[PDB]
Symmetry: C2
Subunit: 114 residues, 2 copies
C-alpha cells in the first residue's frame, strides 16, 4: 500500500514505525548514530541497561524500516557496524529534536509532578 500513513487509523503500519523509532532502545540507537558508525558493542556500551537480545531486536526493526546500514566484518574479532541511511538521518533529526526538548524542559515537568 503506497499511501501516506494515518496514525489515527487502527492498523496503519505508521503505528509500527512510530513504535520502532520511539521505543526506549530505538531512540537511543537513533540519537547515538548521529555521531557516526558504531559497532554493536559501542551501542550496547552507551545504553546502560539494554540486553543483547533487545538491542539486536531494535537494530533489526530499524534496519528493515530502512533507517540503518548494517555491515558485517567476519574477520577476527568479528564485528557488525551500524550507521544511518539518508532516510534514517531524517527520522533521527525528528527523534533528537524531541529527546533534546525533553532533556531541556525536564525541570519544569518535574516541578509539575507533585
Amino acid at each position: 500500500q503506497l499511501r501516506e500513513g494515518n496514525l489515527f487509523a487502527e492498523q496503519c503500519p505508521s503505528r509500527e514505525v512510530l513504535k520502532h523509532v520511539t521505543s526506549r532502545w530505538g531512540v537511543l540507537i537513533l540519537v547515538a548514530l548521529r555521531d557516526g558508525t558504531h559497532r554493536f558493542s559501542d551501542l550496547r556500551r552507551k545504553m546502560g541497561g539494554v540486553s543483547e537480545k533487545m538491542l539486536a531486536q531494535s537494530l533489526q526493526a530499524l534496519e528493515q524500516d530502512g533507517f540503518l546500514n548494517r555491515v558485517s566484518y567476519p574477520v577476527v574479532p568479528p564485528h557488525v557496524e551500524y550507521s544511518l541511511t539518508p532516510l534514517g538521518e531524517q527520522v533521527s533529526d525528528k527523534v533528537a529534536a524531541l529527546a533534546d526538548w525533553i532533556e531541556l524542559n525536564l525541570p519544569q515537568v518535574l516541578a509539575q509532578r507533585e
Copy 2:
C-alpha cells in the same frame, strides 16, 4: 537537564508518555483546539476508555494539558494544551507527520 542514555533518568518516563501511541494522538488532536474526552475517543481508532484515560492523566500530571470538568448532567470533560504542551506537541507532531509522509519509502525497504 535529562540524559536518556542513563538507565534511571526521569526523561525516559516523560518520553514514554509523549511518544506512546495514544499520547502522540492526544497531542496531535489537541492542536486543533479543545476536545471532549468523547471527541478524542472517536478519532483514535482502537483506543479503550481506560487507555485514553491513562494517557490523559499522564500528560496532565506532566504539565502538558488543561482539564476542565463539566459535572452538569450528562457530565463531560474537556482538554486543551498548556503552553508547555504546545511546545512538546510541535515536536511530537513534526515526528508524526514525517512518519506518515515517509511511510511509502519505509514499506518499500521492508519488501527488499
